[PDB]
Design an enzyme around this catalytic site. Structure first.
Site, PDB file in Angstrom:
ATOM      1  N   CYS A 151       1.083  -0.794  -0.405  1.00 24.91           N
ATOM      2  CA  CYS A 151      -0.050  -0.056   0.170  1.00 24.91           C
ATOM      3  C   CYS A 151       0.791   1.130   0.090  1.00 24.91           C
ATOM      4  O   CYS A 151       0.823   2.242  -0.417  1.00 24.91           O
ATOM      5  CB  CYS A 151      -0.679  -0.144   1.533  1.00 24.91           C
ATOM      6  N   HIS A 178       1.877   6.067   9.712  1.00 27.61           N
ATOM      7  CA  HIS A 178       0.789   4.641   8.798  1.00 27.61           C
ATOM      8  C   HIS A 178      -0.279   3.846  10.421  1.00 27.61           C
ATOM      9  O   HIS A 178       0.448   3.776  11.195  1.00 27.61           O
ATOM     10  CB  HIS A 178       1.761   3.054   8.455  1.00 27.61           C
TER      11      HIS A 178
END
Ligand SMILES: NC(=O)C1=CN([C@@H]2O[C@H](COP(=O)(O)OP(=O)(O)OC[C@H]3O[C@@H](n4cnc5c(N)ncnc54)[C@H](OP(=O)(O)O)[C@@H]3O)[C@@H](O)[C@H]2O)C=CC1
Ligand SMILES: NC(=O)C1=CN([C@@H]2O[C@H](COP(=O)(O)OP(=O)(O)OC[C@H]3O[C@@H](n4cnc5c(N)ncnc54)[C@H](OP(=O)(O)O)[C@@H]3O)[C@@H](O)[C@H]2O)C=CC1
Ligand SMILES: NC(=O)C1=CN([C@@H]2O[C@H](COP(=O)(O)OP(=O)(O)OC[C@H]3O[C@@H](n4cnc5c(N)ncnc54)[C@H](OP(=O)(O)O)[C@@H]3O)[C@@H](O)[C@H]2O)C=CC1
Ligand SMILES: NC(=O)C1=CN([C@@H]2O[C@H](COP(=O)(O)OP(=O)(O)OC[C@H]3O[C@@H](n4cnc5c(N)ncnc54)[C@H](OP(=O)(O)O)[C@@H]3O)[C@@H](O)[C@H]2O)C=CC1
Lengths: 334, 334, 334, 334
Positions: A151, A178
């Protein structure tokens, strides 16, 4: 249209299923997990992060029924026993996180599949593709075990490609603030990474990322020019990338932003997006693009060092890119 | 022995008190807030982030009694009516967050105090000091309204100094992943900054910081050389600086790490720390230094680009600085 | 049809608006706050809990435009200077939390309004109404300062009503495990309530509630029968009432569950709901009903002591009842 | 004095260890886990919830050295291969959560141990002991595999005992608003309990408990007069029990609270504490006591129904009773 199967019905598995629902070109016909159809139906219907699924979700025997279409449920932990060939599945999404080396994911092809997309960085994969950056280097004859990358690599690449084409990057670092994932621990417990061993919703947890390195697999000219780290923080979803790079050309905040905004409307429409609004992370939860430039955060120093900040819903945008790649690969024939 | 008065008994004021108890050189005799002695004793006694105060706290009349010593409690909204003289307070810590401009902070002097330390960046102050970096430039004859900078500047300045003195910083960008503070909102509500207006415990909130530019006050030769931003995330205390700079010389990780470690064991002892343990933010909650280098994260690309990471307990590190600044001023003779 | 003004565009104020948008029988024509139209606009558009508003929100000078409609934006902190009379406003939703005593809320009447709805437990109000329980006692010629009670009372009154008519409650106690609201503090700070003065996102906070005795106002039959407390926990929205009570009649879990389910499908349809799914809090975020029975949690001991658990989105469910009371009141002549 | 072995070095195993270091009667000489010595010593050293252990911890070979004392580290996934007898261990603390059936817990005795304490509720265990309530029923001859119960039953049993002894419990229901534990899930993942399968930090999650019913295994008179449920919230540690009991004798708050105070400072000192302070969860992090009465929350209705709220640090208080029980066992003869 193209039959697809998902091995591992988890965060990414269920989110790909949700995304697949709106793609025409593909149709998920079977899913494999370690749980029964009733648990699978529940976890699919109610999501903490993404909400209630808006479809008719039901279970007949051990087969899901979503909007009247029956999905087959397997519980065969060994990928070579699934029999994708018995049920016509051409594409298989490998999202268990356990079969990332080409020899393991290959078991799906053994079982009858034609193409395997691994929803994570891989080892010895036939090809690594970031949609919008290098889907074009795909060959149906030679590539069967494709890695969609991570990602983080999906967020960075698209705007590293622009920055590079336009101003040229000499070097830079990235940090991805994140959200936590299922690979972490709720409370201090064993983990190979001693930092990920710590309570996820309680600290800023520095960790490694190979996302900065990985981008060279899709943007070869960036090999050895980038690196970075990660910082897992206490949000359940949505992450942000903060790239600080030294470029070859001299620029200003205004030229950098104009460039990103142009790509977002041109070549990367759907992948790269451009926001001039001062939003936070919870506002990007549900975002389908891979990267949204927080235009308000762009900075330049000495005319040669830029700081770009991009948002990405690690589950939604990535899941969508899995669907996109699936459908793209399918269109190149198989 | 030097009488200290605290104006604004919030997060920094209470902690400054807590820190003050460890140092005999100064004696906190007065505190001003906007609540009763009883509300102050409780909030002083029980801390969600730091735990119970180890000392006897009581309420006598409307003064606090901590370890038998009675501290005068005031409720003066208007600084001008505090009468610090009447009670002998020599140095005042201005920690309300409301009087960061000379016009207001000076009111304490006109009220009878000799020195004022603003526990935050200020406007029109006599001098801005970050201990371990330029306190030597304090002038007891010329400086009365002293600013102790921010918690971020206090973190970055002491190591920025090392990297620069010994390597040379051409340019740099920074990001501090910061815990949320009392200036934010629990739920979406009005705020001058529409980012800090959003529910603090629910998102990663990018926001601004003048810290980077504020380094130039204490390190004049880094003026216009670094810039940055902040990212408030869902943790109650402890923050981290992420500096990415381009050095004059080509170094290695070991090179950089050797210098910071050396500095912490000598040069900047008690201010700068060096850690080779893979810890998380929670581990630094209670730390008194200003900056602890996460040595496992130092990184280098090309030999010219460096990334150094540093932990700082934004409340405890900073408040121990306020106590050290207040002890140093007093040593110059009030 | 009926024109509405919102005083205090807060969490309740903006969620009442979102609710009203869907209703044609009402019409929000103006809002007051302590900020500018641009700030209100952004807050109305992006919500950290409920997401983005699906409508066209923009600014026209000092006025808000939502889907082609113009809403008057004021910033008058004194209800006396509101002039609802001048703009045609009939119903004013008083949701600031500062004017819940008749003496302060009636100012809206004097300002030209015809009815005032206090979005919280009021003092000296004309009538407190829980939609579903007693809106029948509303007298149009007598009652003008109306209280819609609290979110917790709106949750509890529906099922306590049902259990009491059905088997009759003899005495019970409740606890509302509630989400934190904007009345609490981010990190330890002064508060009239020392429980609520503590970091909200950090602990389980016991606190008081008047909701259980407030029930007596809408169901006088239960006066002096109920009592209870609350515990604020680290979730931004959705709460759950925990009722344990002594019955006049001996029953089975199955009978108690049948009564509640019947009321929800009949009389209390749209206000009282019933569920047999094993759900969690995030799942009720967005819920419009006031009270949802979690049937799986239903318990009985000695056939006389029962336990009933019910969910309620404290912001949405409650915001919808304000709109409902608005339309009911309207229809009865204004 | 008595050599103890810990099996399962988790939240409970490491916490029992911290506790045991401070107890003169017991001596942990060995621990068994399923990870390397270095992972174990880092987990013991740094704790996200309890802090840095004050003691020198190191790894000499595959062994841990704590305060000079070398601890033997084994990694036998199977109890009987542990050879507790060879190293002279008398009591084994079973905290894996995998060997709760006396048949599995007996394997330690097979391996040479004399006694086994299961740190959880057990099936067909020899005796279930709650310190302060029935340690007097322990028979050194008849009992070898002993269960210490659950943290919840340890919080409830001591005050239930007092209430029923002084007033007499006709019946009651309970709810333990509990922090999340390792048996939960980070983000929606497979789980036997569909409520526990949901993101632990994001929601209030209703679940089941054996506690209320398990009370009878220590207080038989109370068989049948109790039941309850659990609600796990977004806190990493410290739980609170909320019991509402229908008493036999008519009492007042002052009377209920006086009886609890007496016992807390008399017969149950060390186990039941009594607080009149307006505290919150974070305040009981580190409490060694099994139950602290929140005196302020005590309330009664109709002179016969009462609600008593009690705090308990689920990791620390429970870990201190295991050591206690271990020391009591040692005293009765091995
Ligand atoms: N979450 C995110 O942000 C992203 C994750 N990824 C990657 O995707 C992969 C999975 O991650 P994620 O979805 O996040 O994690 P989850 O743990 O939520 O998903 C993994 C799933 O694999 C299932 N599973 C495990 N083994 C098998 C098996 N042998 N057969 C069938 N099902 C199995 C697990 O089932 P069970 O729970 O029953 O054990 C679980 O449902 C990893 O490679 C991860 O790095 C990539 C991008 C984003
Ligand atoms: N929090 C941190 O980590 C750091 C903060 N700072 C700086 O420290 C200052 C304080 O921040 P912080 O401590 O977090 O904030 P807090 O909000 O916790 O404390 C602020 C205090 O000021 C009091 N106050 C406000 N006005 C007055 C007044 N007129 N007279 C007397 N007392 C008053 C408030 O009383 P009341 O609560 O009743 O309204 C409150 O307790 C700010 O300038 C901030 O930038 C610097 C470094 C670190
Ligand atoms: N939140 C919940 O779950 C529920 C709350 N309630 C009740 O609703 C009422 C509002 O609460 P809530 O929505 O949570 O809180 P908020 O703080 O979000 O809303 C209060 C609104 O009051 C505004 N305000 C304050 N003073 C004035 C003034 N003098 N003039 C104009 N606007 C003003 C605030 O503006 P500003 O923030 O800029 O100062 C804010 O926009 C309270 O009585 C509460 O008890 C009822 C049911 C549910
Ligand atoms: N947590 C609390 O609040 C309380 C829990 N309990 C009980 O304590 C027990 C464990 O609880 P908790 O500490 O919370 O859970 P944890 O998961 O933190 O502890 C489990 C420990 O056992 C280890 N383990 C698993 N299997 C084996 C094996 N076969 N051999 C050796 N070690 C093994 C696990 O290692 P690994 O991490 O590498 O898998 C881990 O260190 C349960 O019975 C629980 O119900 C009782 C009171 C309180």
């Amino acid at each position: 249209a193209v039959k697809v199967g998902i091995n591992g019905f988890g965060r990414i598995g269920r989110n790909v299923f949700r995304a697949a629902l709106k793609n025409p070109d593909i149709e998920v016909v079977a899913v494999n997990g370690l749980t029964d159809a009733n648990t699978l139906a529940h976890l699919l219907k109610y999501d903490s992060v993404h909400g209630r699924l808006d479809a008719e979700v039901s279970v007949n025997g051990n087969n899901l029924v979503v909007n009247g279409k029956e999905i087959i449920v397997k519980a065969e932990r060994d990928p070579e026993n699934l029999a994708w060939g018995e049920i016509g599945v051409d594409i298989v999404v490998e999202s268990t996180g356990r079969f990332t080396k080409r020899e393991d994911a290959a078991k799906h092809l053994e079982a009858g599949a034609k193409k395997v997309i691994i929803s994570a960085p891989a080892k010895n994969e036939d090809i690594t593709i970031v949609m919008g950056v290098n889907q074009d280097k795909y060959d149906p004859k030679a590539h069967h075990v494709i890695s969609n990358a991570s990602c983080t690599t999906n967020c960075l690449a698209p705007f590293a490609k622009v920055l590079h084409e336009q101003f040229g990057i000499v070097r830079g670092m990235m940090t991805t603030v994140h959200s936590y994932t299922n690979d972490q621990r709720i409370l201090d417990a064993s983990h190979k990474d001693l930092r990920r061993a710590r309570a996820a919703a309680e600290s800023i947890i520095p960790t490694t990322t190979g996302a900065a390195k990985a981008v060279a697999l899709v943007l070869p000219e960036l090999k050895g020019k980038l690196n970075g780290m990660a910082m897992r923080v206490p949000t359940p979803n949505v992450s942000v990338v903060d790239l600080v790079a030294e470029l070859e050309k001299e620029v200003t905040v205004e030229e950098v932003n104009a460039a990103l905004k142009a790509a977002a409307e041109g070549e990367l429409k759907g992948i790269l997006a451009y926001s001039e609004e001062p939003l936070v992370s919870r506002d990007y939860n549900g975002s389908t693009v891979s990267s949204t430039i927080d235009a308000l955060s762009t900075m330049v120093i000495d005319g040669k060092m830029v700081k770009v900040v991009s948002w990405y819903d690690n589950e939604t945008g990535y899941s969508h890119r899995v669907v996109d790649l699936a459908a793209y690969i399918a269109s190149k024939g198989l």
